[PDB]
């Protein structure tokens, strides 16, 4: 019966460790998303301005 | 100077396609990172169902 509910607590334990880890790896790639969107935003205002100088 | 700035921009383009299929690449990869995403979810809720 020891070994039992030695068991169980770890098994909930995991259980809960790896639904926080899911929920803040979605929420980091989140956050990487979103500067490479920044990214993305400022790089093709820069092909803009290449594309003008191409002109200069 | 002007071969200079020619063969400059030349690379500055070069550089930019590069950069752009990198990018290219990488937003390939968001997507398939958000079908992996919704994948692990769907999965993980049919075995907490």
Same mark, same amino acid.
Request: net charge negative.
């Given at each position: %019966?020891?070994?039992?509910? #030695?068991? &169980?607590?770890? $098994?909930?334990?995991?259980?809960?460790?790896?639904?926080?880890? !899911?929920? %803040?790896?979605?929420?980091? #790639?989140? &956050?990487?998303? $979103?500067?490479?969107?920044?990214?993305?935003?400022?790089?093709? !205002?820069?092909?803009?301005?290449?594309?003008?100088?191409?002109?200069? | 100077?002007?071969?200079?700035?020619?063969?400059?921009?030349?690379?500055?383009?070069?550089?930019?396609?590069?950069?752009?299929?990198?990018?290219?690449?990488?937003?390939?990869?968001?997507?398939?990172?958000?079908?992996?995403?919704?994948?692990?979810?769907?999965?993980?809720?049919?075995?907490?169902?």
């Amino acid at each position: %019966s020891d070994k039992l509910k #030695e068991a &169980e607590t770890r $098994a909930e334990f995991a259980e809960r460790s790896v639904t926080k880890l !899911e929920k %803040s790896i979605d929420d980091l #790639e989140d &956050e990487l998303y $979103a500067q490479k969107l920044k990214y993305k935003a400022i790089s093709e !205002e820069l092909d803009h301005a290449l594309n003008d100088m191409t002109s200069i | 100077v002007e071969k200079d700035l020619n063969e400059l921009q030349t690379l500055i383009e070069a550089h930019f396609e590069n950069r752009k299929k990198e990018e290219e690449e990488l937003i390939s990869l968001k997507d398939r990172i958000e079908k992996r995403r919704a994948e692990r979810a769907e999965q993980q809720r049919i075995r907490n169902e």
